[PDB]
Amino acid sequence: RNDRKVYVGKVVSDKMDKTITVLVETYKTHKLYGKRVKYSKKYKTHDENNSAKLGDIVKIQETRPLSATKRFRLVEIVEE
Amino acid sequence: NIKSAIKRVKTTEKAEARNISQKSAMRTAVKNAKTAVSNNADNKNELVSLAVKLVDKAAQSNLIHSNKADRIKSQLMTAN
Amino acid sequence: AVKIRLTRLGSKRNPFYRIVVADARSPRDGRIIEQIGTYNPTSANAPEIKVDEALALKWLNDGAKPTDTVHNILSKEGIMKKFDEQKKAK
RNA sequence: AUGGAGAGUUUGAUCCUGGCUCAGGAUGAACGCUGGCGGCGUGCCUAAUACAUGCAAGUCGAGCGAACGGACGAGAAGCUUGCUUCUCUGAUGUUAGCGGCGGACGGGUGAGUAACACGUGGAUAACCUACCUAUAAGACUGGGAUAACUUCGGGAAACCGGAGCUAAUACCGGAUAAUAUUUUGAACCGCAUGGUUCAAAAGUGAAAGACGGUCUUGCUGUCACUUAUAGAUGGAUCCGCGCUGCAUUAGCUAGUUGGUAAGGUAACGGCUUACCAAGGCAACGAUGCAUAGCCGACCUGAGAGGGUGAUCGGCCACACUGGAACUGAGACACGGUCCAGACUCCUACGGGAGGCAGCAGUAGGGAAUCUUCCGCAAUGGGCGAAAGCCUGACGGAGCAACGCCGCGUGAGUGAUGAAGGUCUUCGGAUCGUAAAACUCUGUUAUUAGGGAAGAACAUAUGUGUAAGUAACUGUGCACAUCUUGACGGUACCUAAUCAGAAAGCCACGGCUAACUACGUGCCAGCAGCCGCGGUAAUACGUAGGUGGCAAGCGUUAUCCGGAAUUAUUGGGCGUAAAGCGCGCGUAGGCGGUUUUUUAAGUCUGAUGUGAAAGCCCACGGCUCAACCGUGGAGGGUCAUUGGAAACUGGA
Ligand SMILES: [Mg+2]
Ligand SMILES: [Mg+2]
Ligand SMILES: [Mg+2]
Ligand SMILES: [Mg+2]
Ligand SMILES: [Mg+2]
Ligand SMILES: [Mg+2]
Ligand SMILES: [Mg+2]
Ligand SMILES: [Mg+2]
Ligand SMILES: [Mg+2]
Ligand SMILES: [Mg+2]
Structure with missing residues (x-):
């Protein structure tokens, strides 16, 4: 089986129902200067049991579109 | 303008007339069956079978796609 | 369907062809699936032909159909x- | 190591800072002057303005009824046995219509689009797919109609309506047949949802013939048909990352964000609708505004960069404007339909017709961009069993120095330095070996002969072979034979004749290679900048001479360079432009020493991929070159996976 992409980030919003927003931080090198700059993307993730809470590190895997904006699911909670 | 196009207009109309009649007959059957299942009528099974038959025949004529036919057959048959 | 055909190259009054597997609806000198060989009609009074047997046989098996010259x-x-054998x- | 030039101009003079300007390269260029040819390319960038005319999509009689044509050849003698009719047979054929397939391709354009549109890398346990290939199982039994046609009727027309009649591989019922649908057993498995496989029932779903072979009260070949499952192909969705300016645009959003349920779609999903909650996005630039098809590439630069997105290829979007569905495997459809609008056209005023951003072509706009050509011979596509038909795709031809490359406009000898022009110290000097003269050549030109490749074929005709069959015909495969070229009597070749017909353009104060005379006199003019010209101008205009290029040479426009003048490479801020008046601090950036560990950055491999074309390198083919072909090399901030661990990060 081909593998879906997996990301690790911190939950920044738990307000929505059965949903958590996970901020994934990556570095983008400047094309000219060459310095890496911190960049963040919020990924809307499915949390069926409303298990996760703001401030917990989480592992998310890509899925089929589960909503208008939700494309990922919560694999596990790495830290709390 | 073009001769084959002028012919295509006629054949489309004839096709459309046959198609709309058959689609209406199927649509009536599914409606009638659904009401029968909901009302728990004594004719539930007979009406459901008529619906499935007409739906199945519609799929072969390519009036509806097979996936819709399967959806409709399934929803009726789950109900009965 | 899928076809093994000659795509034109070269210059005016100097044809060269690549033997390619293409969808029929594709333009002659456009999108292709794979190239299997080349054919040169005007070369030294003898057609110069390069073809990959492994590729040609795979495509012939999968239902690709040659044009008459191919x-x-x-x-x-x-x-x-x-193929026949x-x-x-x- | 293959690659890197500077100059002028601020001053009385100077060094520095600093802008301005120039020498280079490039173009779908245009304009001015001029103009021999060939090869290979390129040629509406503006009005996605409006479009006269022809053409750009058909095909199939081996699906079907019918009609035409009526051979071969049936009867009487007009006494005309060469002409005659219906009382026949009626062959090869052909066509309007029905039906199938195609018309969703190919071709055009870049308006819209700042978006998963595109590029690159992944995912679909959320998909769909005519034709083609393969395998398996089938193709049973009936029926009712309708074009064409005939007749009647209504219309100016476009084109409708009624009655009667008639086929199909047209349409429809029933039978039989699913891995499809429901339900119940299991077994194994992944990445939530879930996938897979095997059993037991239930409801429900097909089809078709045509043309041939034969041993013909029945088998069979080819093609067509149906269902199921694969392959191939094409399409769809999602996502990571990359991909544009403006904050004198800071807030934005209410199907909006999520959930639940239902409907809907190939399919996941606020996709939609009710219901519930208040979410979602934004200084890591939301929202708005402006502009724009994107890419492979292309131009420039030593490079890093900067600029651009013609031709060709890929992807996307559009088809008078706007909306919509129908048919279909596929369209919400350039040369289809319906409606609305604008425009154009016809009319009997009731109502009709139309869409060049297909190829030519026309008008208009513009600085500016081609022939109303030839052929399906080649390659490719649609239809057909096939011959074949259709094909403005395409192959060719035409026009244009628009570009690139190649070759010409002569060559040898030639002092006797002729004549003449120009200058002059009046001695001469220069044009000038230039000319003439003499000799020679024929690229080219002209004339006359010869004369390619591009052609593979398909088909048909034999022979063999393979599968299948009782056998045959066919079918696949192999080998022979005939026949097919728009260009075109073109390219090329040969012979004869002739230096005869074939050079222009800009510049010459400096940058910057090349100076004098005369005219003119801050005028007329020149000019990229410094400037030049007011009476002895190498700067104006002309002449002689010279220089640089050459079928071109100049000018203008635009981009990169020089410009280290946005400086990562590669600059600065005491007085030249530039340190916030100064604190307190938030985000962010950055951070002392050792050990252990990890491996995100870093380093080193492997695998997949980054189309083709192009660039580069090599080789080969064109007389050379341009050009063409082939093979490498290169191109990611790429993904996946294996190592190393100093440094950065994490613990
Ligand atoms: Mg635009
Ligand atoms: Mg430079
Ligand atoms: Mg069309
Ligand atoms: Mg048209
Ligand atoms: Mg030249
Ligand atoms: Mg001048
Ligand atoms: Mg620079
Ligand atoms: Mg100052
Ligand atoms: Mg201070
Ligand atoms: Mg390439």
């Missing part, structure tokens, strides 16, 4: 007999 080429290179043997 069939002549695959006959000249012996691929069409090989295997297919009869099957």
Whole structure:
């Protein structure tokens, strides 16, 4: 089986129902200067049991579109 | 303008007339069956079978796609 | 459907062809699936033909169909007999 | 190591800072002057303005009824046995219509689009797919109609309506047949949802013939048909990352964000609708505004960069404007339909017709961009069993120095330095070996002969072979034979004749290679900048001479360079432009020493991929070159996976 992409980030919003927003931080090198700059993307993730809470590190895997904006699911909670 | 196009207009109309009649007959059957299942009528099974038959025949004529036919057959048959 | 055909190259009054597997609806000198060989009609009074038997046979098996000139080429290179032999043997 | 030039101009003079300007390269260029040819390319960038005319999509009689044509050849003698009719047979054929397939391709354009549109890398346990290939199982039994046609009727027309009649591989019922649908057993498995496989029932779903062979009260070949499952192909969705300016645009959003349920779609999903909650996005630039098809590439630069997105290829979007569905495997459809609008046209005023951003071509706009051509011979596509038909795709031809490359406009000898022009110290000097003269050549030109490749074929005709069959015909495969070229009597070749017909353009104060005379006199003019010209101008205009290029040479426009003048490479801020008046601090950036560990950055491999074309390198083919072909090399901030661990990060 081909593998879906997996990301690790911190939950920044738990307000929505059965949903958590996970901020994934990556570095983008400047094309000219060459310095890496911190960049963040919020990924809307499915949390069926409303298990996760703001401030917990989480592992998310890509899925089929589960909503208008939700494309990922919560694999596990790495830290709390 | 073009001769084959002028012919295509006629054949489309004839096709459309046959198609709309058959689609209406199927649509009536599914409606009638659904009401029968909901009302728990004594004719539930007979009406459901008529619906499935007409739906199945519609799929072969390519009036509806097979996936819709399967959806409709399934929803009726789950109900009965 | 899928077709093994000649795509034109070269210059005016100097044709060169690549033997390619293409969808029929594709333009002659446009999108292709794979190139299997080349054919040069005007070269040294003898058609110069390069063809990959492994590729040609794979495509012929999967239902690709030659144009008439390509069939002549695959006959000249012996691929069409090989196709028949295997297919009869099957 | 293959690659890197500077100059003028601020001053009385100077060094520095600093802008301005120039020498280079490039173009779908245009304009001015001029103009021999060939090869290979390129040629509406503006009005997605409006479009006269022809053409750009058909095909199939081996699906079907019918009609025409009526051979071969049936009867009487007009006494005309060469002409005659219906009382026949009626062959090869052909066509309007029905039906199938195609018309969703190919071709055009870049308006819209700042978006998963595109590029690159992944995912679909959320998909769909005519034709083609393969395998398996089938193709049973009936029926009712309708074009064409005939007749009647209504219309100016376009084109409708009624009655009667008639086929199909047209249409429809029933039978039989699913891995499809429901339900119940299991077994194994992944990445939530879930996938897979095997059993037991239930409801429900097909089809078709045509043309041939034969041993013909029945088998069979080819093609067509149906269902199921694969392959191939094409399409769809999602996502990571990359991909544009403006904050004198800071807030934005209410199907909006999520959930639940239902409907809907190939399919996941606020996709939609009710219901519930208040979410979602934004200084890591939301929202708005402006502009724009994107890419492979292309131009420039030593490079890093900067600029651009013609031709060709890929992807996307559009088809008078706007909306919509129908048919279909596929369209919400350039040369289909319906409606609305604008425009154009016809009319009997009731109502009709139309869409060049297909190829030519026309008008208009513009600085500016081609022939109303030839052929399906080649390659490719649609239809057909096939011959074949259709094909403005395409192959060719035409026009244009528009570009690139190649070759010409002569060559040898030639002092006797002629004549003449120009200058002059009046000695001469220069044009000038230039000319003439003499000799020679024929690229080219002209004339006359010869004369390619591009052609593979398909088909048909034999022979063999393979599968299948009782056998045959066919079918696949192999080998022979005939026949097919728009260009075109073109390219090329040969012979004869002739230096005869074939050079222009800009510049010459400096940058910057090349100076004098005369005219003119801050005028007329020149000019990229410094400037030049007011009476002895190498700067104006002309002449002689010279220089640089050459079928071109100049000018203008635009981009990169020089410009280290946005400086990562590669600059600065005491007085030249530039340190916030100064604190307190938030985000962010950055951070002392050792050990252990990890491996995100870093380093080193492997695998997949980054189309083709192009660039580069090599080789080969064109008389050379341009050009063409082939093979490498290169191109990611790429993904996946294996190592190393100093440094950065994490613990
Ligand atoms: Mg635009
Ligand atoms: Mg430079
Ligand atoms: Mg069309
Ligand atoms: Mg048109
Ligand atoms: Mg030249
Ligand atoms: Mg001048
Ligand atoms: Mg620079
Ligand atoms: Mg100052
Ligand atoms: Mg201070
Ligand atoms: Mg390439």
